[PDB]
Amino acid sequence: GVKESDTGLAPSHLWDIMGDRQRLGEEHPLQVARCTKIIKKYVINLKQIAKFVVGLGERVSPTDIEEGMRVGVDRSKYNIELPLPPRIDPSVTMMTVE
Amino acid sequence: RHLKRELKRAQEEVKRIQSVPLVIGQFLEPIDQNTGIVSSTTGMSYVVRILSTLDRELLKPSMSVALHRHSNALVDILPPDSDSSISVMGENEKPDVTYADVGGLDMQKQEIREAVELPLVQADLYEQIGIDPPRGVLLYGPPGTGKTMLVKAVANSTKAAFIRVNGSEFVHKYLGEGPRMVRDVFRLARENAPSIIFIDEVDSIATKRFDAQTGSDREVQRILIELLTQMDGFDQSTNVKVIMATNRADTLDPALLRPGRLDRKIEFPSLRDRRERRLIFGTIASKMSLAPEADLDSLIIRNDSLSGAVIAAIMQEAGLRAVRKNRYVILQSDLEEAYATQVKTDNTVDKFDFYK
Amino acid sequence: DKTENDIKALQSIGQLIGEVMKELSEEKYIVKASSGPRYIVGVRNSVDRSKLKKGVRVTLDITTLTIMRILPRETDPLVYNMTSFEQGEITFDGIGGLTEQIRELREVIELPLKNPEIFQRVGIKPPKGVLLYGPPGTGKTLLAKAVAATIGANFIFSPASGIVDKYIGESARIIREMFAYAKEHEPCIIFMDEVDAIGGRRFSEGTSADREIQRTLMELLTQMDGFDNLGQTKIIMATNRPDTLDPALLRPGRLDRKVEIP
């Protein structure tokens, strides 16, 4: 075929059936946001600049949600799903980890 | 014959799509008589069908237009005078200054009357003789010589539409709105021609240097390209081009001062000779109540440099000080005191007089 | 009464605010919405077509975008924090030792408010614009503080550096409001402290940060005196040192009195 190919076209057949199960599941998309204030409830800010007060996901304890932390929220009614590792600057200083 | 009646009745039905609400676009340019290009005020361009039986003569010159919200179809047209953020003043906001309040600078008065006034009243003279008409007018000079005050006078006399914009109305906060201000302002002039556009200070928009990385700069570049484009489109109208002032001359973009755009450069001096100084003192002092003992001739010799705005301040100060003494007139004691303050001009020989 | 008030409250719904950009016809006006898009909207039969003209601010149903009612003019939240300030009173003899500068400041601020008939006699146009400058710590803010609790006119208090915003030209909109607010409530005073932040020198070779400042400074010049003259609005500047102020602002006439406090 050699159109929309980027692999050895042998492990991508099996990968093709695996991606159908991930497309049906909503592990993604998760819109990436960041916390601004924990309210003993959270004050989330989206990147498209519009702020929301959200609840809590059934995936995670509230112990793991911290100040300023990057968090993924639902595509629809915004709810905190998964904590993420911080820092968006890493793209010059990540290049020098030897 | 029966089909001529039904074409009328069946044409009332497409006319009933025009309804509240509508979203406003601006007809950019044609590409067919059944399709054109619009640019919504949302920031999006669209290529949409035109509605049958609409004026194809009036769409082409950039005009505001109506869209139907839920498809962006071009269901009808709006007037050319409408949807203008900034409208023609003059109803009663026209300033009170006139050529009589203005004093000296007689050379400048003559130039600008020849640059702005004579083309409107008599276009024919310029063609006959075979000179190119001075088009755009530029005013530079060091701050406070009466650049704006000479333009106030001109707003009264002309009896032609007048559109007055600060240079900061063009910087918007949302998007593409800078380009949208320029496009409106030039159309509005052409519509109620002949017309004068005045940008009080154009300096920040006409800057010489751009980083072209920060968003802020990338948005000014668009405003400045549009101004240059429509400055050449202005040609072959009754309109006299934009007249604009800046107290800075080193920072100007030289892309404005190429020929065919801004042509005539006016100068306003800071230096005042002895004759031209007495002329300014004469007009301010004729309004005010003075003793006949006081005399302007005593003043003019002392300073060898002074400008029309420093003189304005001196008269205020002599007339403010007259209130402390409680004197109807400005006595020559007040006039002298007020002269020595708001002059200075000593930084260079202040204590370094041994250079002579 | 309060828990039944929530049930009835949920039947109401917000209304997108706009302003009348220009009367097209008596049936349909053009309104610009605060969200952004310009619309052509209908009218209610209750609303007086004679109060709907260019400039007035209206509200819209979000269902139909049809004019629901007239609204008075609304003061931005920035300009409300600037009037909020000033608490308590400081005596006007509690400033002492500078009794001469207090009187030269009243020649500009107190006098033309009460008796514009005296300045009409001589024939001179009243002075506006006062520049306070002196060594740091001499009391240039104390003088302005005392006189703004005393006089009784509406008083906008503005840290010069507190009106800069990140977004493009948002700093332009603020300065226009302050003069629009003041022109409305008049007689009023606008006082700006430490005006080196935005009265900086010319530059035009520096970064983009310098180029944004140049745009608010260019505007502040044409707001004091352009075509339209201020009314009973008086403007007081305070600075640590006048040397680093742009020459177009310092200029006699634009800020008439230049009071030195020793």
Binding site: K37, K51, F52 | - | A9, Q15, T75
Partner: protein, 81 residues
């Protein structure tokens, strides 16, 4: 006995509307009973305020929640920085 049943019945309908999540705003002005809020989606709505959330608490610029489905002042939010 009837006053205790009124406050439990109306509270089941307040708790359904108070459901998370909900947009954030601040109050550009209280007309003073009206609140014009400027939402954090950068538009402006006028509304006759919810009489449960007092006009006393509200001073310009303070944060309030707003029900995203239909713009009502749902609650008052703690000030934060």
């Amino acid at each position: 006995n009837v006053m205790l049943e009124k406050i439990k019945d109306n509270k089941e309908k307040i708790k359904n509307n108070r459901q998370l999540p909900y947009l954030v705003a601040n109050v550009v002005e209280v007309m003073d009973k009206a609140a014009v809020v400027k939402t954090s989606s950068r538009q402006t709505v006028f509304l006759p305020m919810v009489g449960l959330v007092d006009p006393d608490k509200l001073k310009p610029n303070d944060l309030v929640g707003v029900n995203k489905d239909s713009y009502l002042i749902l609650d008052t939010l703690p000030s934060e920085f």
